[PDB]
Structure formats: C-alpha cells, structure tokens
Ligand binder design. Structure first.
Ligand SMILES: Nc1ncnc2c1ncn2[C@H]1C[C@H](O)[C@@H](COP(=O)(O)OP(=O)(O)OP(=O)(O)O)O1
Length: 330
C-alpha cells in the first residue's frame, strides 16, 4: 500500500512454506524443530543413533549413504539395518562388490542369511541394474550395495580413462541414481551404500574431497552417515570392542548435524545394553557416581561392562529402561 509488512516470522514461514511446496519437505529447517513422525523407519539397533536420525532409524523410502574409514562400523550398522527390516517381514537384498561378508557375523547380529539375497556383479554397471530391477519388484524393502567405490564400469578400473572426454564412474552413479531414486520409493524400498576412507577431520588424498562416485550420491542421499571409530573398548584384558561415533551430516528427513555413539563388541555387534547405560545416564533414569551405575535405587554394577552384563542377562529391567528412554524421547 506504501507499507512493507508482516512480522518477519509471519512472512518467513509464509515463504518458508512456499519453498516446501516447490522443492519438497526437508528443503528448509530450524535445527530446533521436533517436526513430524512419519510412521516409517528401520531401527538401527542403536537407540543412540536412531534418536539422532530424528525418526527412530533409517527412513524407509530413502537412499542412505554411510561413508567412513575401514573397520569403523558402517556395515555392522548396515547388517543390523537388514536384520530388523528383515525380522519384521521385510526381505533384504545385498549387492556385494567387495566379496567380503561373513555370514556368521551377520548371523550373530540377527540376519537371516539363508533368506538373504546376495549378488556378486561383474561390472559396476550391471550391479546398479540388478539392484535397480530388484528394487522395482517392490519385494525387497532394504537393499545394500557394498562399496560405492568398488563399482568399476565395463571400460575398467577406477581412476583411469581418456581422450576428448574423460570421467567414468561418477556418471554411472549420476545415471543409476536418478533412474533409481524415482522407483526406489514409490515402492518404499530404502537403499544403503557403503562408501569409504581418507580421514577423521578433513578429506585429503588422491583427487581429494567429494570422491570416487561421490557427487551424485552426495546429492541424492536423503541421509548420510559419517561413521568414524573413536576409541578401542578396553576389556581389562586387551579389548571387547570399539566405540563408534556417527555424525549424520545430511538429513533431509528431519534436522541434521546431530550425532550418536555406541559400542561394537568384537563379534557380537552393537551393544544394545551398553547403549542403554549411556542413554540411560545421559537422560537420568540411570544414576552414577561411585563408578556404580544404579537404576533408581537398585544398582546394576560397578563399571560400564559389569552393569552392561547385568542388562544383558536382566532383560526385564533392560526393557523398562529402553522403554522409559523411549517416550522420554519419541
Ligand atoms: N566377522 C567379524 N567378526 C568379529 N568382529 C568383526 C567382524 N567383522 C567386523 N568386525 C568387528 C571388528 C572391527 O573392530 C569392527 C568393524 O566393523 P565393520 O562392520 O567391519 O565396519 P565397516 O564395514 O563399516 O567398515 P569397512 O569399511 O572397513 O568395511 O567390527
């Protein structure tokens, strides 16, 4: 009228709404928001991690990337990811390109191997196809491709080509990805890609940042987990496991930048127990000091691991805590 107008807020969310309607949901966010609870999500075995994913676990219907150095967790997470959506009626396909999977490990974590679909492609091209048409059938829910890096095209090798044009791999990805993101979730079949290595504070190396097939996946991924090993879980003797830190650096399904930790015991998986003590204390329900963890009056033991076994063998109480923790969160 000759007036500018609405209180920032009343005009911000007026446009901020416009945005969503034009580019989607996760398009704009206030890191603080609790924002929605879509009734879909694969638990990640770590109450720790999935209360950080903002939706109780990996969002069914989304390409999920889990990069991170070697021997730090990704797949152990992945496998668990499978175990669950599998142990809930789901069928998980696994496109192996690393040729390094130990079923009895996947077994100990609760994966039904015999009913697990494995595939060992020959070209990084074929792989994306058998996994593209394997996901179009809508039978699989969770499909995990091992190594966004070991996906070398027919013209071969990863980091070699030439003349009047150049770049291989990152294209096949670009390709597969578009063509796969579509279908991928009309079916609601969430996908997971293990990617990996070169850091713990900054990406430097040969042909540095971003990566091998990166870019595309780095843009299609609706979630990205930076899984890096932090410390070697001592066990009095040498060591029971490793503690893992996860920095969900990209979350299109809620707020990003959060993070969780948890342990992985050498052959046994992500410790549900240890994970309840941690959560259990960082939210009160479990009291400390004296190095004696105590669940409201009743004690658990003297020293993480001891209270850890207590919870291991005492499921009754354990469930309670997982519980109390559950609604104290979401
Ligand atoms: N078959 C196994 N038996 C016992 N422990 C295992 C086994 N496989 C892996 N681990 C343990 C040892 C390591 O400290 C830890 C690493 O987990 P892992 O799932 O192998 O990480 P990752 O698969 O994400 O990383 P990488 O990139 O090296 O493949 O788990």
């Amino acid at each position: 009228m000759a007036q500018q107008a609405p209180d920032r807020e009343k005009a911000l969310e007026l446009a901020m709404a416009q945005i969503d309607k034009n580019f989607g949901k996760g398009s704009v966010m206030r890191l603080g928001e609790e924002v929605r609870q879509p009734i879909s999500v694969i638990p990640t075995g770590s109450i720790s991690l999935d209360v950080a994913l903002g939706i109780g676990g990996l969002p069914r219907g989304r390409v999920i990337e889990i990069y991170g150095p070697e021997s730090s967790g990704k797949t152990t997470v992945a496998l668990h990811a499978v175990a669950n959506a599998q142990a809930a009626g789901g069928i998980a396909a696994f496109i192996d390109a690393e040729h390094a999977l130990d079923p009895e490990y996947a077994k100990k974590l609760g994966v039904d191997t015999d009913s697990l679909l494995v595939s060992q492609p020959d070209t990084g091209e074929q792989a994306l196809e058998i996994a593209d048409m394997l996901v179009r059938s809508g039978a699989l829910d969770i499909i995990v491709i091992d190594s966004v890096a070991a996906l070398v095209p027919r013209a071969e090798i990863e980091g070699e080509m030439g003349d009047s044009h150049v770049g291989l791999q990152a294209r096949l990805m670009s390709q597969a990805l578009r063509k796969m993101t579509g279908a991928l979730n009309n079916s609601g079949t969430t996908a997971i890609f293990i990617n990996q290595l070169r850091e713990k504070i900054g990406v430097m190396f040969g042909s540095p940042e971003t990566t091998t097939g990166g870019k595309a996946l780095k843009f299609y991924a609706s979630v990205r987990l930076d899984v890096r090993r932090i410390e070697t879980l001592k066990d009095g003797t040498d060591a029971v496991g490793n503690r893992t830190r996860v920095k969900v650096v990209k979350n299109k399904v809620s707020p990003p930048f959060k993070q969780a930790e948890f342990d992985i015991l050498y052959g046994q998986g992500i410790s549900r127990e240890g994970s309840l003590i941690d959560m259990g204390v960082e939210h009160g329900f479990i009291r400390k000091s004296g190095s004696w963890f105590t669940y409201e009056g009743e004690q658990l033991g003297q020293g993480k691991e001891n209270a850890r076994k207590f919870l291991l063998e005492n499921t009754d109480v354990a469930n309670e805590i997982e519980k109390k923790i559950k609604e104290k969160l979401g």
